[PDB]
Design a protein around this ligand. Structure first.
Ligand code: HEM
Ligand code: HEM
Ligand code: HEM
Ligand code: HEM
Lengths: 145, 141, 141, 145
């Protein structure tokens, strides 16, 4: 997928103003709450019995930072993405056995997080850019599958 | 299937939307057309430009239909039988499109009511919208 | 949602299956494990070899559950509340897997009853299996 | 995706014994009957009001032969599939606007057709091979998307 100059702008503009700390666990928490079957992969994290327990879980917030980070590496490699996520594509495929369908879900939840943080600033034009990015990352991880 | 908790969240959340239901419906559509342009092929008769009167008007129609589904959350098949005929029978809308509209609707609610859009509410609305979509994509008459 | 026609097709078709319901359930699973190996990770405690006694035995359990759903096609949520707890709450099965099992089940029926598997029946069963899957993947208690 | 020698065998063995004539419209007919929204793309074909009308429709059977044919071209190019379906990938993407999700559906319906024709012969081992092929063709057409 190819990105226009206006699209690279919208993505990089927001990445600059966001809480990389707290926003990671926010996304992972929502994934586990809205799409319950995903808790099967994070069974080892401990207490995932309630929305409060999940969001309060220390290991969810920690892993959240890691996920958010790998998204920043994507913005840095917009022209050539596939080569950057080959390490994670193998990890999630052969090592974890996660269906690619779930990568799209995390991407959507990602877009919803940005909407709650930026409100009116997260315009339809800005959203279109992020959807395009999210779709590219999802299909980069599905190389093995 | 919706749990009693889902029904409570959906009712409580839609109440907070209130008067702006029409303004939100218009925006969800504007976002969908922008983020997923292939959905534009379903509205050839529409002037899809920036602040179209048709789009803002259809947003109200879509919003009222949803307000109606919340009231009849226990009898959706019977209450939406007319819309099911339109979308499934006459128009023949591909179900994947419902997922796209549901997403843009959630995104819109998240931007205007970030405080109220808790993970718990998000989860219940996602399920609710999924039920509505199932009904509108099925031929059951 | 199922139309009255779907309910008739499902009842008529499942009747023709009859006694072999258990033999068909066993085969659908054998095909699923072969065609989609990732589904094997849900049965670590199972000896998944060629003619396993566990697999042939689980096929009967799965088949009886479906026979039960056909009888209660009008009250699936209440009749399958136990299985919904198991698959959705306890095991946490990814919904995509239900589509894979539903497919292999249809394929099995097509091979043993090619004369009876008309496009109309196929369509009704696909919908029926989709309803069952929705119930087993939802947390509604 | 890579194919084993036993897998290339199973696929080519059946392709040899099948009714390329009548089996094309059989598949297309089932697609339109089981997944109704797909009739939107073949609206120009005429009467698609009933299972009988759809299966009896002359252009459904005609177009069916064409689809079955493009599947035969896949068996001959099991090594490098992506390059062979680039003409159709563009046609279905930018020209027709068909969601990739529908390609998987036609593939499944394809497997079900073979099951009705070969009965007992269409073993689980044979099915596994065909599923693999069908999945590859589906993702070859999704190059544009
Ligand atoms: C946007 C797509 C995704 C990205 C960018 C991503 C990123 C990552 C990263 C950076 C790690 C940590 C690897 C390391 O420390 O070496 C990881 C591991 C992991 N991911 Fe993802 N992930 C994605 C989607 C998913 C989804 C959808 C699931 C399952 C619902 C999942 C489940 C896991 C699991 C179980 C681990 C291992 C955790 C551990 O080591 O304790 N990932 N992922
Ligand atoms: C949450 C799911 C949806 C709801 C509640 C909904 C609601 C409605 C309503 C109330 C109308 C106008 C009915 C009337 O006044 O007769 C309508 C018409 C229509 N809908 Fe939807 N709809 C939904 C999803 C979709 C989707 C996903 C598509 C395709 C992208 C679509 C396409 C259309 C079209 C083409 C019309 C006809 C427009 C016209 O009035 O000329 N709808 N829908
Ligand atoms: C048509 C949908 C399905 C039906 C009717 C069904 C039916 C059943 C039944 C009746 C049992 C045994 C219940 C008992 O005796 O307590 C069961 C258990 C189980 N099911 Fe399913 N199931 C379905 C789909 C799936 C799918 C798609 C998966 C994952 C690939 C799955 C995984 C399991 C597992 C792991 C067990 C526990 C096995 C054991 O007894 O040790 N099921 N299911
Ligand atoms: C296994 C995936 C598919 C294959 C191999 C395939 C193959 C073909 C071929 C060979 C043609 C004729 C092109 C020509 O004559 O130049 C075609 C055109 C077409 N396909 Fe497909 N197709 C596939 C899936 C689909 C699906 C799922 C849909 C929509 C549900 C679809 C809709 C159409 C349409 C509307 C045309 C144009 C018909 C016309 O020219 O009258 N195709 N396809």
């Amino acid at each position: 997928v190819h990105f226009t100059a206006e699209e690279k702008a919208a993505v990089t503009s927001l990445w600059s103003k966001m809480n990389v700390e707290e926003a990671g666990g926010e996304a992972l928490g929502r994934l586990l709450v809205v799409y319950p079957w995903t808790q099967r992969f994070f069974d080892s994290f401990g207490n995932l019995s309630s929305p409060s327990a999940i969001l309060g879980n220390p290991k969810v917030k920690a892993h959240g930072k890691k996920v958010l980070t790998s998204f920043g590496d994507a913005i840095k490699n917009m022209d050539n993405l596939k080569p950057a996520f080959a390490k994670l594509s193998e990890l999630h495929c052969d090592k974890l056995h996660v269906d690619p369908e779930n990568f799209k879900l995390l991407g959507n939840v990602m877009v919803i997080i940005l909407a709650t943080h930026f409100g009116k600033e997260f315009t339809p034009e800005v959203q279109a850019a992020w959807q395009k990015l999210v779709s590219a990352v999802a299909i980069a991880l599905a190389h093995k599958y | 299937v919706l749990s009693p908790a889902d029904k409570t969240n959906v009712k409580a959340a839609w109440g907070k939307v209130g008067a702006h239901a029409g303004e939100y419906g218009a925006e969800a559509l504007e976002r969908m057309f922008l983020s997923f342009p292939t959905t534009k092929t379903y509205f050839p008769h529409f002037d899809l430009s920036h602040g179209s009167a048709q789009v803002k008007g259809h947003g109200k129609k879509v919003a009222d239909a949803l307000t109606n589904a919340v009231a009849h959350v226990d009898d959706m098949p019977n209450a939406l039988s007319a819309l099911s005929d339109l979308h499934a029978h006459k128009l023949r809308v591909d179900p994947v499109n419902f997922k796209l509209l549901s997403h843009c609707l959630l995104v819109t609610l998240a931007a205007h009511l970030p405080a109220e859009f808790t993970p718990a509410v998000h989860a219940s609305l996602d399920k609710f919208l999924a039920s509505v979509s199932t009904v509108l994509t099925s031929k059951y008459r």
